[PDB]
Amino acid sequence: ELRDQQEQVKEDMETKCFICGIGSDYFDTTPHGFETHTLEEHNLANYM
């Protein structure tokens, strides 16, 4: 269960944007939606 938790942390981080919640689903229709979204639109470091 612990190992599943560390795996789920990475899975949720990669399939969902932390800043705004939903992600990689509506953006997935646009090519490279999630990558651009997390690099420019909604990024954790840019808020700090």
Ligand X SMILES: Nc1ncnc2c1ncn2[C@@H]1O[C@H](COP(=O)(O)OP(=O)(O)OP(=O)(O)O)[C@@H](O)[C@H]1O
Binding site for a copy of itself (CB under 8 A): 21, 28-29, 31-32, 35
Q: Which amino acid is at 44?
A: L
Considering only residues 7, 8, 11, 19, which one is a binding residue for ligand X as defined by CB under 6 A?
Answer: 19
Binding at 26: pick from ligand X, Zn ion, a copy of itself, none (beta carbon under 5-8 Å per type): none
Binding at 18: pick from a copy of itself, Zn ion, ligand X, none (beta carbon under 5-8 Å per type): ligand X
Task: Print the SS3 string covering the chain.
Answer: CHHHHHHHHHHHHHHCECCCECCCCCCCCCCCHHHHHHHHHCCHHHHC
